[PDB]
């Protein structure tokens, strides 16, 4: 999946539109009015993440072997 | 204004890649040896093949007919050209895919009117819907006998 | 292993004996008092487990793998030993001792599972100790004292020894544990950040200045603030989530955060400087950012 990510990142006629390189995996420095590169202001920092919910736990417990290590949580 | 749609198809990757390419050249010109000159550079036989081509057939007429200033394209002394090729190679012209793809060549599949009136999502769903099909038409598979019945 | 319960079963009472004048861990005296008796605990175990000091080899400052005995009764990694000992050097890195023939006893009956049930004891002890300073120490909403904080911050650095200097070990009270690259965890960090941000702004700054100055000099200190930044995020939600107020108190209070934000990113630009008020401003307006979006 970081492969395929990397793939449909770069089909070459979306990559020229500048809305999936704000987005889908370039830093943002070509956009000319901006702050110089800082330690804070690189892509990585201003990146998006998860937000946990109990569901994706329950897709963990199913990938670690929930119902044998852990099977009250899995239940 | 010309915001292009997303080709979620790239997932098989180097191989419909270079098949959706020539398939959109041949839309753009008229010569269509080139698709049968990029079917004779491919692994994967003739299920895979005929998957590839009919994901690229969908998605350059998609691409065409959903936009309002390209709109029936083909019929402009093109849908001859791609006709003639179905007529001549074998590799899609089986009467159940071949019926589908004619189908899909003069607009009367109902699938594109699938009239989801939530026009962000209507595109998503369309695209998984003809995917699907592909596979249960292009795939001759146990596991799929059920669901192309259904 | 039934042979160490007349240990243990002396050490209850011991923590009772300790604990029996001030019942309360989160001050400094019974913290520092649990601390040395668990200390001598293990201390005390190891000796009565396998005669003064399983040790981790003094090569690569951890622990041994197919273990082979010198004749001054050392505890070394064979690849270590065979890595080192085919020069010149046939003695001990150690206590100098000169060794006669070859690295031939190796035993791989005694000290395999030694250095086993070790792990998982200082495994057990481990959750032990974050159980208890998950627990006691954190216990109400008002936190803990400054001396025990000091102590809990101290205790996640293995402070300098002769050999790589100042690695970084998983919150133990012990010191025979390593990571040979410099891993930094967010443990401590969480059951810290359940108070209130006001009242904890010092000691993670503290830890911060620690953590550039012995650790994360000039490497990639991007995963170490990305950390820091998710850290606080997650303990604003849970400081939201978790506590019973409406919609209308936390928008009007993040909007007055957002119309009166001075800039000030001069401060903590250039190359190193990141102070944990500035982190959490950063983490503040992504979570303002979310609720907008
Ligand atoms: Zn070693």
């Keep these: ?75 | 204004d010309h915001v292009s749609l997303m080709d979620r198809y790239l997932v098989h990757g180097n191989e419909y890649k270079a098949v959706r390419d020539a398939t959109a050249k041949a839309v753009l010109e008229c010569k269509t040896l080139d698709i049968g000159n990029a079917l004779m550079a491919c692994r994967s036989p003739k299920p895979q093949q005929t998957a590839y081509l009919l994901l690229a057939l969908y998605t350059e007429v998609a691409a065409l007919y959903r936009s309002p200033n390209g709109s029936l394209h083909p019929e402009a002394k093109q849908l001859e050209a791609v006709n003639k090729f179905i007529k001549e190679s074998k590799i899609l012209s089986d009467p159940n895919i071949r019926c589908f793809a004619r189908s899909l060549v003069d607009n009367t599949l109902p699938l594109l009117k699938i009239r989801s009136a939530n026009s962000i999502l209507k595109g998503t769903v369309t695209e998984m819907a003809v995917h699907v099909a592909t596979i249960l038409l292009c795939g001759h598979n146990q596991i799929l006998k059920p669901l192309r019945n259904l | 292993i039934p042979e160490l319960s007349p240990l243990v079963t002396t050490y209850v009472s011991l923590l009772d004996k300790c604990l029996e004048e001030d019942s309360n861990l989160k001050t400094c005296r019974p913290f520092v008092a649990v601390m040395t008796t668990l200390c001598d605990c293990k201390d005390k175990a190891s000796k009565k487990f396998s005669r003064f000091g399983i040790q981790p080899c003094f090569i690569c400052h951890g622990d041994a793998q197919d273990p082979v005995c010198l004749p001054c009764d050392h505890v070394y990694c064979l690849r270590c030993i065979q890595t080192w000992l085919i020069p010149g050097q046939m003695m001990c890195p150690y206590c100098l001792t000169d060794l006669p023939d070859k690295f031939s006893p190796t035993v791989s009956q005694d000290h395999r599972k030694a250095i086993e049930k070790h792990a998982q004891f200082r495994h057990m002890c481990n959750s032990f100790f974050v159980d208890l300073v998950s627990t006691m120490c954190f216990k109400d909403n008002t936190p803990p004292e400054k001396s025990v904080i000091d102590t809990l911050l101290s205790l996640l650095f293995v402070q300098k020894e002769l050999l790589h200097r100042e690695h970084t070990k998983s919150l133990s009270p012990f010191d025979d544990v390593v990571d040979q690259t410099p891993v930094i965890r967010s443990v401590l960090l969480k059951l810290l950040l359940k108070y209130s941000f006001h009242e904890v702004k010092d000691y993670i700054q503290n830890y911060l200045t620690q953590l550039e100055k012995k650790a994360f000099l000039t490497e990639d200190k991007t995963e170490l603030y990305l950390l820091f930044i998710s850290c606080l995020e997650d303990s604003v939600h849970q400081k939201t989530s978790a506590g019973c107020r409406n919609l209308e108190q936390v928008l009007r209070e993040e909007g007055h955060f957002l119309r009166t934000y001075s800039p000030g990113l001069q401060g903590q630009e250039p190359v190193r400087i990141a102070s944990v008020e500035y982190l959490q401003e950063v983490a503040r307006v992504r979570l303002c950012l979310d609720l907008a979006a």
């Design chain 1, 1 to 75: 999946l970081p492969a395929i990510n990397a793939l449909i990142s770069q089909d070459e006629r979306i990559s020229s539109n500048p809305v999936t390189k704000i987005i889908y995996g370039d830093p943002a420095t070509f956009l000319p009015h901006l702050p110089q590169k800082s330690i804070i202001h690189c892509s990585k920092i201003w990146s998006c993440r998860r937000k946990i919910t109990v569901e994706y736990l329950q897709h963990i417990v199913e990938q670690k072997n929930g119902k044998e290590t852990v099977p009250v949580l899995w239940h």
